[model samples]
Target: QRQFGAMLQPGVNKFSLRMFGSQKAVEREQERVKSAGFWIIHPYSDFRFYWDLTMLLLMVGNLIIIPVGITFFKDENTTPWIVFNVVSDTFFLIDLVLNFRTGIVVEDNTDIILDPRRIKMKYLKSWFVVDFVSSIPLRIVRFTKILSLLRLLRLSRLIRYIHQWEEIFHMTYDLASAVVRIVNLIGMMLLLCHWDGCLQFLVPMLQDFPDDCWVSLNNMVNNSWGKQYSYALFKAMSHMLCIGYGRQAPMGMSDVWLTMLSMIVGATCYAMFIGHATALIQSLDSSRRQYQEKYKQVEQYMSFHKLPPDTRQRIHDYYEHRYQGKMFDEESILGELSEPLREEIINFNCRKLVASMPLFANADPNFVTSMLTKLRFEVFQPGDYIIREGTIGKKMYFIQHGVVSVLTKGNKETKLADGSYFGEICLLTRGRRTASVRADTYCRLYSLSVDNFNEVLEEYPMMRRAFET
Candidate 1:
């Protein structure tokens, strides 16, 4: 079995040195190592935040800072800027080493042979070319020479890594898909053109041409009527676009036949382009519709799980404080009342439904918040029999603003006031209602069905335990 211990084992280089040295020396080294690991791994737990910030810094520094600095402070700070470049390069080398240490070796798959991670130290040693290229140190002054071109390419590779900061490229999927469709359409048209060229060559030989079969083949390759046919197609295209470059062919063939052939070729190409474009548009339309539907489902899910307005406002306030005087307007929604108003609406409508169960009354705060947000609002008029006595009941009702009368056999009718809830007995036991409930005076209450109530219990098991306990 592989023995597991702390990161620094007994025989490790630095730890071994400390073992033979003083206790104070080992303690200092351990502290330094711990601090470095904390700094490195702390970002890994919440990687997105630091990743986003790092990419933003790199993008702004490359696009705005470096360019503007070159224009404004070029002469005054050239030395410092060059120093910065050298330091960044040196750090990048160390980063590359760390990346390999974090287990970036190639898999055994042939498909990934060209992957950057697959280019191992052994490969560089065997190749010799890579070693010669990378042997020199990255100095800003030395980099600004003939080798600066290669250094610029290296800079571009660093910039490409910034793409993973978010879903930045997903925004252009439509454009990219369109481009791919066009390329495929063009390929189909070229295939048809090549097929036509082959047919033209075969026709003369098969129909007993006056010249030798080889001559006919050579003619097809050299200067057969294929050029004239292609030119005629181009002429039709030009005319269609109102840019006619009036040209004529030598009279080896009838004008009637030539005209018909030209029209057929041009129409085929145009139809292929149009048909391909139309199919792509239709496909995209269907995809867009499905995307919208999925987006709606996701939006509903988010609304269901979203924090309450007061809590969200606190988070927004933190974001604003962190980015003071910066462009974080897109991230703040503290002033918006729509979210809170929606919650209040739900609570008002489901007040009776929530009160129906003693379980909800003693639920956890988070569970209460979730139930309030998801519960629907409902109102019932007077004389409405909410549940019949001894009948199966699925829903519990909470009286928000009116009275409800409970009628049971062999007992006087009982009245429940505002804030009172009912109908939990059937839900808890999966049995019929013990008594009937009737809206006595235009009762407005929230109602939660047994299904929805149980869903909440399943989601918040602790709340269920608390209720049972």
Candidate 2:
């Protein structure tokens, strides 16, 4: 009851007293408030499902305004453009307010700061200035022609959209292979080039242009707005690809410098891409060779020892399944990661397997985390005794894959498959095993030592009752 009371705000608690029509309604309200509060303070919590859709709409609106603003400045229409700017600025101003209240990670990078004052202070120190400058309605200073240039500062808001793109990049990278990652990166580069071309058109290089300037260029340079934009996009793509086959060539010193910069950047990017692709190929080939050499050594040892054909075949099969031809130490690789990152990787890989067991399904997250970190992967061959009936059991096994059988004193046997767990009875009872367990096939298992089990349960005395029951 105290736990439930703590979940509600003072105002909400008071309101629930009079508003509730039934006991069940009060309970439901309490749970709802609790869930809402949990998300509110969680640094990683996202808004409701439509939040991304809303943000996407805002981004598209901002993008549309960029071209419209550029055209409005060049044409006779001013009133409608000013109204649109004011409306967009209003939305951005609201966004800035929401940002101030959003939960953020603290200095330790492990906890969230939920206090409004602290959250506001952090935002003010970081993105508040940028958001403020971008959200401010520059149309107010339309009285002066020179001050109108300040409208360009609104472009800074696009940085927020670019940041969102980076988030997408990271998510895509997680799901993609190295080759896919390279392709995605190149795609991002092309997108940046397209946006750059659009921006250049918005703020053309020459301060002033003659009416005949468009006519002076190639047939590709046209008065049609759509054609002009198409040409700008084509020019940017051509420059980035180092094709140097654009329909309109550089006509001025500024254009010449811009082209040179694009060529240099394109060359650098191409060189890096080639280097990364080569490294990936080399890594794959090297791993293959290492596996072949290890298998050769194993065959030679078997022959020298005059091992039986069945035993030799079993050894080969074990290696084939255990490593699948790729051999590397998982611990050494994970050791290079930070503690939090290591924990996250472990959680991502094993959370489902751990949660599938009834014993851990209801366990505290911290307890599960401790057990996950201590888990050691082991493989057992068919006919191997995992546990002897009369011997003491110091550890428990969770079957990640394969099958095992438990043999009782009466010779009765029970089979356990994937997601099954055993040996916890000894840990909880603090006694010897009541039954023997043997691998029925090649078993992939995760073991948790008795000491780790006790260490975690000691912190949660109530949880010990769960094992007892």
Candidate 3:
């Protein structure tokens, strides 16, 4: 009767089983376990989103503890560290198991892999090895005290954490790609330097903090742990950037390892940061570049012809009012699309226009779509005369946005804003304009030519009558 409902969620009997109490309910409860005790989580389910968010927040704690807490804490020094270990490690273990239950969408069409065996195969072949290794509670092992480098295996968890961010980016719409890249770059910078910072101290600490070591030489041997950590963080940050913002130079044979890596990473990290910065600003300037291209072309034409100052000002005003230094060629861009998609995009963009005007709103959807497809979007600058009184009118307009004024022969002015129309009387009467319409502000308008109007109206004459009424 069903296709197992996208991840095979048990819907109806499951809910009914809660309300009714009978031997049949107990029978099906047993059957539920027998038939499908194994669960499959829909990739985009609400429960999954909650679990995803919960694990993400939990992962944040893991990330913070990795560089700093691993170097700083000991069993004798802190008991909470052990507690933190058990809880987060177990959740990580559960996360590993959850991966097996979580259905995956195939890359091509986003169809879910609902079959448990297929999902199992995908997870096994995917992050399973790395995830399982990182999930191991190495802290509980005795070697965790001396050969604590076993904890380094958990750095693989950072990979999965980065993978999780792409999922978050897809789920959250407000995040821009550039913003995400910058955020990720910033995180990488912090962690790379943090790990380097921790590594600096770890090397010296492992070597017994000898007289030659930076810690002892700088008189930091007996200092507070906070100051030591700050020193490490500071050194790593400046050294990582290759900036000569020197707080402490690496001072020992034991320090050569840290210093060598610092110099290489400084170049690498600086180059990478500049790469992201360039791309971030590059995409941001893309729209402005389009306008500037047009602006420059027009300035060439204006200067070449030596057009009058008044006409040049009006042209500049039109450009400014249309896009405020950002522009795109909207007409030909839509011109490239197939009719169905183009109709949909125009309707989507001008929903306010349709919502406000009753003729389009109440008419047949096909009729409206037909009429909307023929409509041409145009903009007029403030004080621009759209239609002067007694001038022949060849178009009807729907005001998509902005404001305009209608002038009667008596010199009376009536203002209209977004979600209104003008010039319809001239089109309907097939005569000269009875009133003049002038832009009061930069008016965003869509005009339907009289020929296209009559073409569409002949097929759906009721719309023409509705417009007349």
Candidate 4:
């Protein structure tokens, strides 16, 4: 069992000195004590922090260089290249050894496991296989022909660091956190592009460097290493954009399949990016969405009924003028406020409308408040007829803006601009409209209908007879 576990045990260097010397010296409370030489790396230690950071850096470099080496430099085991290669292998091998003495935890993991043996077992059970496969320094025997491919297993450790860096990334609680998320996606895009490109080159290597391969087909052998990878990345990015497949076609089965898979992977990424881009850029505000959604249904309401095009445009223009692009069910919001607050706010909203009329300015603030409270605001488009000639006029309009033209008996017209009230003669006399009132521009007005007029005028009977004559 110990022998089987040893093979499973990560960081199993061909030779380890710890077995001969420190085996008997450890098992005590000495696990937590100071007698050791080069002891355990605590989780919170600066050592582990920098260690993981450097490992991340090393992996990133290896991730790029190792694949590039596999694709282009496979035949040449040149000194500088192998030296860098072997040293990186040794670094990971040592990293595997250090993990046996690195601190860890259990249960909720609040309690650190100080026992050295326990740390080994924990590391053994979990990441051991990936680390061992990736990092084992096996230069002693040339028994293995597939030489450097095992280094790719180190890439598995990447999933472990995402949560580690997540804490560091979200520490500043800014809404600009979205910026980092997009930044992370950019790195993901670059890495995926790099990985996809290198693997395309690596596939034919796995297939004994076939004749129908992209490298053979494109005649990339004599090209400088940069031109090769540059072309590779060029093909990769183009395929990811989901085009350029037929130009230098893949004739082999492996070639066809791998490139097909790359294109499928491309579809999802760019498609995924399209969704994220919109959410992050446009909908993130979350305020205007209510307006947009409500406007959409309202637009559908008109179109579904088969409204004429000019009618549709006029309705659309009416909305643009009235709400001016934001939506609120103003009544319910005001209704939620009680009495004094409601009255003050209503007054505040109509303060400008009341200001335009000197007629209301001299009246009692209390009387004016009652009159304004009884009125409903209205909007009219150009060429709208507010009161048709000889129609019973039950409402009187006080215009706040725009123009209204009154047509007289001679077929002549008179324009009443701002600060004007109209259709009042019929309201007082209880007769039909004497003349047609047409809007010459988009108009905003407040109208006091019959019931409210009588209600307010009776309450303050002092002003009723002034207009009666």
Candidate 5:
């Protein structure tokens, strides 16, 4: 209840009165104040569902409802369809009013108003434009059914370009990082191009031309030359293209200077424009990839059974910090989670697994806790065949204090002791398990699940890349 109350401001905090007030107060205030229960249980609590519904509702309203309403109702001088437009308009009006009343639209810039204490003309003007454009009936055409379809204009209200803008705002730093890399590459390319072009002009200037002979003149000016000359020729051609195919080039020294200046300026601007655009594209793509990876982690954590509360809290904290607002620190966020919360989560989940290993008995509590959190526990009983021969696998297991026998063909058996680890070869290989391992007696063991194992492998990718071979 305290946490819930923290979300509201003074005078606006109606949840308390609703929760604790008399029955009459509750009933009367219900219409004035949205129920706290409604917010707590709101299906929007699920991030994916919230985004999906927001998109779905926008599509239905724009693509289906408003268009269909307009299509069938514009010519109806006296029909039930006309009433539909009134109702829809009234609903939209109410939406606009509610959004304003709740200060959702005004929250972005509070200081712009003429007077902070009261609603100002600037606020009214901005909102009036939005309301007027959104509320106009220009879509209602006269006579023709084809023209009536223009009523679909109301559907534009459902568009949420603001949400997309919000996403871009949150990823500003990532976008900036991408821009820096692109700028550096573009700068390098420009330098290379300019140098090669300079070399083209310098080569002929440095050579002596025979005044009476065409041989020296032709030899010096010939384009093919060699590899270095070829490089210069292509560079010069690119510069010509930059100066509008050299049509604007002057024949005199001043003309050449002006043309070169124009080419350099054009190339600089062109490179900047292309580099910035490519940076934005790459940044957005990278942001989307990151969003997917983080969202998937949330989904997996939520689905796990018997998860500890502390672990759940850390997961929730990490996610809330990751996507909660307009800015987040990716580098620091992981380090923050790595402290007490992550270790606590892992220790709580892997308790049974830790107890089975004799090394854990002599281990420092902190060290054991860290290792325990990294381990996952699995249960199997006597006579249970754990690993079959010739089966592909990616996890290795430790016998906490369990008895297991490795069985080869023709009755060969090797009993392994407590603290023994098996399936190491499978963890390292594309090959199948060489022999079968079964519970020789009632056993207790700890297993690292394949997915987690692979995740750890990714952290040390270079070593694993080499290890795989």
Candidate 6:
């Protein structure tokens, strides 16, 4: 049991000294130790906020280095470029050290293993090789210019930081989060075009194609570097859109293959962009769409049965309150979250409503929590029968908003306002309902199943007795 406890207890690092000061200080140290591995490896963390920001800036800097490196490729005495490479490599070397020291979570689990040896082993096995290769100053091995070109492989580190790009877009546009997502997809397509264009520029230079060979290709290969790049960009964009204007037809097998590859990638990218954009637009007008869909269905049903205008209007008003007023299915959304997260979300949304009920007031928190989990939100239109007198009741309801009318067998009616509860008498006695309940207005209610109510009452018999009285 002791060994099992030692292994199972989280935030208890073997390397952490027992001489830590206060409880809070110990907790902070434990959290720091657990998060050390993720500080460099993961892009998302409140603890590694500055780390993420720094790495994002470094990725952008690496991208900028690509153009500078291309410019200085022919210049043997490029002192400024050499210094920049050294500084950039130095930061990467430091990151490599951090990666080794950081604590990491065990595979397929959230448990952070803070043992120094395990942490070192994890890094060495995973991304350490990439980090080491990218951090090395390969440019210093300039005995052959081709060997120095290997330094450009460091740019591959930018791929690891790609998620940060979307993170930045989301953070920048909280209100138009959907717009930011669409824009991010478009940006990715543009980046793909830029990368393809850059690769195309290198193909001709590497092949040592002569000016005559370029001239045969409708002046597609230009003497001016800027013009060549511009043409490459235009060609890439055209191919990506699968729009091949005959003006820039392929001159050779390489160009043909490259154009075909671009078209395939472009078709897929275009499909994704269209899908995302359509989904975003649909989500924005979801309430309206839902209203229209429901309206059409109700209209069809009413027409098929030849229902009266008054009944049709009532159905229309019910849908209007449901879609226009409520807008979303809160229960369905909440159900998607993890249990703990879902509980907290439900508690936040229903706390006031639960507190408003006299039955729950001064009730056991455990009972209330159990009850809250089983509650379902319901909307009733005015004049809609919520409960019929003498019917076996299977549920109880607490009014969150609007009013309801309780009608006895004697035809005597009483108004129940917000915070009032009904149908409990049937649940407690396991008998028929004493009154018929109808919505006085468009009533918003939280309903509890008799099973859940009885289950909870079984645990707290005193509460059940109190209700019976």
Please give the lDDT score for candidate 4.
0.71
Tens digits of per-residue lDDT for model 5, 335-363:
57956776565555556545665534754
Which pairs clash in model 4? none
What CA RMSD would you report for each candidate?
Answer: 20.4, 11.8, 8.6, 15.9, 23.8, 8.6
- Give residue 44's lDDT in candidate 2 (0 to 100): 28
Model 3's TM-score against the true structure:
0.64
Residues 321-389 of candidate 4 have per-residue lDDT tens digits of 887777667688878889999888878777776656656777777777778777787999988888887
User: Which ranges of candidate 6 are over 4 A from the true structure?
Assistant: 1-27, 30-77, 105-115, 138-156, 161-178, 198-228, 243-378, 385-399, 404-438, 445-469
Candidate 3: Cα lDDT at 439: 86
Could you give candidate 3's per-residue lDDT for residues 1-469 as a string of tens digits?
A: 2543332431334433443346475455334433552555545344555666787677666777766876754334567777887898788778777778765657522335446787878878876776676667764576665434544566566556557547533542333766777777887788777877888888888777898788888888877778888888888888877776445566676687668877787768878788867766576667789889989999999999999999999998888877889887777888799988887788787665765665556678778777666877798887888987677889888887888888786767798885688776655577667787888777788887888878888888777777677
The CA-based lDDT of model 2 is what? 0.66
Error in Å for residue 66 of model 3: 5.4
Alpha carbon lDDT at 341, candidate 2: 91
Q: What TM-scores do the predictions have?
A: 0.29, 0.49, 0.64, 0.47, 0.29, 0.61
Question: What's the ranking of the predictions by lDDT, best on top?
Answer: 4, 3, 6, 2, 5, 1
- Candidate 1 residue-wise lDDT, 1-469, digit = tens: 1432133312334533433366554455444434433222111112323434654455335443343343222145577777876765564454444333221113311112133344455444543343233323457666667454453344444344444422322334475767775786675565454434333333433455434333232353345354634543454454333343324432223333534564567566667678768776666555446545654574566578876776555544443333332432222432355777756655665545554565557556678777775444466656668887667777766667788888877788888895786775756677766778787776667666778767888898887786588
Model 4 TM-score, all chains together:
0.47
For model 6 the local lDDT of residue 127 reads 70
- Stretches of candidate 2 exceeding 4 Å from the true structure: 1-53, 64-74, 107-115, 138-187, 198-215, 220-222, 248-254, 265-322, 328-469
- Tell me the tens digit of each residue's lDDT in model 6 across 1-469: 5543223223333322233435575566445544554332321233244554676677667675565356324455668867876777787777767666444545322335445677677778777776676566665455346435655666566665555444433443333777767786787787777777776666666676654333346655436666666676777787778767336567677767766777788788888889878866676665666657767887998999998899888877777777674356676787688989988888997887777766678887887887777888889887789988667879888888898888875768788996788776666567777678888888889898888878888878877787677
Backbone clashes in candidate 3 total 0
What TM-score, to 2 decimals, does candidate 2 have?
0.49
Give the poorly placed runs of model 5, Cα more than 4 Å off.
1-75, 79-81, 103-128, 136-153, 161-337, 348-350, 356-364, 370-397, 400-414, 417-469
Candidate 1: worst 10 consecutive residues by lDDT?
A: 37-46
How far does residue 354 in candidate 4 sit from its true spot (Å)?
35
* Model 1 lDDT, residue 6, Cα: 35
